[PDB]
Amino acid sequence: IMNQEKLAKLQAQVRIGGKGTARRKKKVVHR
Amino acid sequence: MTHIVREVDRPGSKVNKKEVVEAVTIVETPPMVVVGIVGYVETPRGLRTF
Amino acid sequence: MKVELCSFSGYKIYPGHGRRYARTDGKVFQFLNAKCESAFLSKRNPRQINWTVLYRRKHKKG
Amino acid sequence: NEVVTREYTINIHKRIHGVGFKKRAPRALKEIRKFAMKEMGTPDVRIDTRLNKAVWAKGIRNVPYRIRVRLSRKRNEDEDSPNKLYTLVTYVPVTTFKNLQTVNVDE
Amino acid sequence: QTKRRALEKIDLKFIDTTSKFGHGRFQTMEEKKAFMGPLKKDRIAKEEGA
Amino acid sequence: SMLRLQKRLASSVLRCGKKKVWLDPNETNEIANANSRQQIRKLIKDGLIIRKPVTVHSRARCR
RNA sequence: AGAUCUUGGUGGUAGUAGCAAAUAUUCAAACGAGAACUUUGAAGGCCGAAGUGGAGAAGGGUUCCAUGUGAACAGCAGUUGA
RNA sequence: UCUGGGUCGGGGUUUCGUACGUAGCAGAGCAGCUCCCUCGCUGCGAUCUAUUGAAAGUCAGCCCUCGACACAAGGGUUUGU
Ligand SMILES: [Mg+2]
Ligand SMILES: [Mg+2]
Ligand SMILES: [Mg+2]
Ligand SMILES: [Mg+2]
Ligand SMILES: [Mg+2]
Ligand SMILES: [Mg+2]
Ligand SMILES: [Mg+2]
Ligand SMILES: [Mg+2]
Ligand SMILES: [Mg+2]
Ligand SMILES: [Mg+2]
Ligand SMILES: [Mg+2]
């Protein structure tokens, strides 16, 4: 689930570029 | 530098009693402060500081 | 201190400033600077330039 | 203190005046780093990538005349380094440059 | 100094005071303001001055 | 460390040029461990490698 | 001692000429003892389909791929490389 | 030092010429709606009008601040009749 701490840092990882670039969809680790 | 307007009092000239525009130069001169005196003496080798 | 002259723009031209232009027809014009002279030579009407005095009084500015 | 941070505005146009077209933006970055070293007295100066993008926004020669930046002096105690302090410079997007003063910004 | 260029009285009539940082066209601050009247910055400053 | 092989394999699998290949700048050691196209496919599925969108060239002005 | 002698070596020149054809690179991070040049990400550019793009013939012959090295070469450097 | 010198900011000057947005029964005209309107209302529309001698730059080798900010008695190498 999402809380305020998780949301504020989520904004960082989904942005992989400046304005006009596609957002990151996922970053999943699986072994 | 700047320029001024004055009347010329030169008889026999085309510009006699006429208006002219002449460039002038502004030289700011604050008063000098005399702080010493040097005396020179004449020698056959020339002037030298006495 | 001499005779004050008016330009294309209607500005006063102090002595030692600008240029005087005499046409072949017998008319004499004087210009405050090269901008006014260039505007006049292109036959630009001073009433259509926003910073000319003639435009100011035509539009009753101020 | 020594972990102080502040906001400034820089006349980039004053410092680029005379620089050739193909060197204007790199010279602006160099002047930014030099100004940070001048103001915070720290040899280590890092420029945020957002500031780098903002300076290069209008290409290589049409550098923006003014820009608003934020200087943050921080500890470098993460490894054995000669300099214990480094200055981080970030971009402050502002609407206008009128009546802006060098202001002390808190945490 | 004996030439008529020298020993000649000089009586100034006008001195240019226009802005030499470009093609200046006004002599004093008051003349420029009187010719131009109030401006936008003057208007807003008077508004702040009640 | 040096991801030229990873970029080439990603461009091969994704069927796009090296311009569109985006590697995660954070998980460099994870991507560098990929040395097979199966591993590249798995990384693409896990979101570490993303095909960047085509540079926008609109025809609205033309229309 | 000579023969613009032959062969081999070394000077001054001289740390000199020079490393200037084809618009242009910047920021952060990673590895590394070492980063202007490697790699990644961001930005600004360029080649603008008669391309600096994608494939062949002749010709080359392993330069192809992967891993490792930093002796020598890539007229600077290189953690990179034909 | 009776502080200093910088960097911003302000003012002065200067250059170009009246910014975006808003508003207009301004505007070549055109396209829709008529219980409506009795002559109206709603769009599209270059350009114009007011805001608006406006907007923007102005030392980097322009002038003046006493507005804000921080820094400046610190470093290093030599020098003897
Ligand atoms: Mg001049
Ligand atoms: Mg011999
Ligand atoms: Mg002999
Ligand atoms: Mg010989
Ligand atoms: Mg040389
Ligand atoms: Mg050369
Ligand atoms: Mg092109
Ligand atoms: Mg090809
Ligand atoms: Mg190879
Ligand atoms: Mg070499
Ligand atoms: Mg100023």
**Which ligand approaches the C-alpha of residue D97 most closely?**
11
Instruction: State residue D45 phi and psi, 5-degree precision.
Output: -130, 130
Shortest Cα distance from A28 to chain F (angstroms)?
Answer: 5
The answer to whether the beta carbons of residues D90 and D73 sit under 8 Å apart is no
Distance D25 CA to ligand 5 centre (A): 29
Query: Using CA atoms, how far apart are residues D16 and D35, in angstroms rounded to an integer?
Result: 13
Query: Using CA atoms, how far apart are residues F39 and F43, in angstroms rounded to an integer?
Result: 6
The DSSP symbol for B11 reads: T
Chain-chain contact of C15 with E14 (C-beta, under 8 angstroms)? yes
**Residue C21 token pair:** 């232009």
What's the length of chain F? 63
Q: 């009187």: which residue's tokens?
A: E34
Query: Using CA atoms, how far apart are residues A27 and F34, in angstroms rounded to an integer?
Result: 16
Distance F55 CA to ligand 7 centre (A): 15
Query: Using CA atoms, how far apart are residues D93 and D39, in angstroms rounded to an integer?
Result: 21
Query: Which secondary structure element, helix H or strand E, spans residue A10, and what is its range?
Result: helix A4-14
Distance D107 CA to ligand 5 centre (A): 53
Neighbours of F23 (CB within 10 A): 19
Neighbours of D74 (CB within 10 A): 16
Angle of helix F4-14 versus helix F37-45 axis, rounded to 10: 70
Chains that touch E (3 or more CB pairs under 8 A): B, C
Query: Using CA atoms, how far apart are residues D9 and F3, in angstroms rounded to an integer?
Result: 40
Q: 């820009």: which residue's tokens?
A: D67
| C-beta within 7 A of nucleic chain G, residues 11-40 of F | 21-25, 28-29, 35
Q: What is the dihedral of CA D51, D52, D53, D56, to 10 degrees?
A: 120
Instruction: State residue A13 phi and psi, 5-degree precision.
Output: -70, -30
Report the helix count and the strand count for chain E, using DSSP H and E. 2, 1
The answer to whether the beta carbons of residues A25 and F24 sit under 8 Å apart is no
The three-state secondary structure class of B22 is strand
Q: B16 — contact with chain E (CB < 8 Å)?
A: no
Determination approach: cryo-EM
Chain-chain contact of C1 with E14 (C-beta, under 8 angstroms)? yes
Asked whether residue F43, judged by its CB, lies under 7 Å from any atom of the DNA or RNA strand G, the reply is no
Resolution (A): 3.7
Shortest Cα distance from B42 to chain E (angstroms)?
Answer: 29
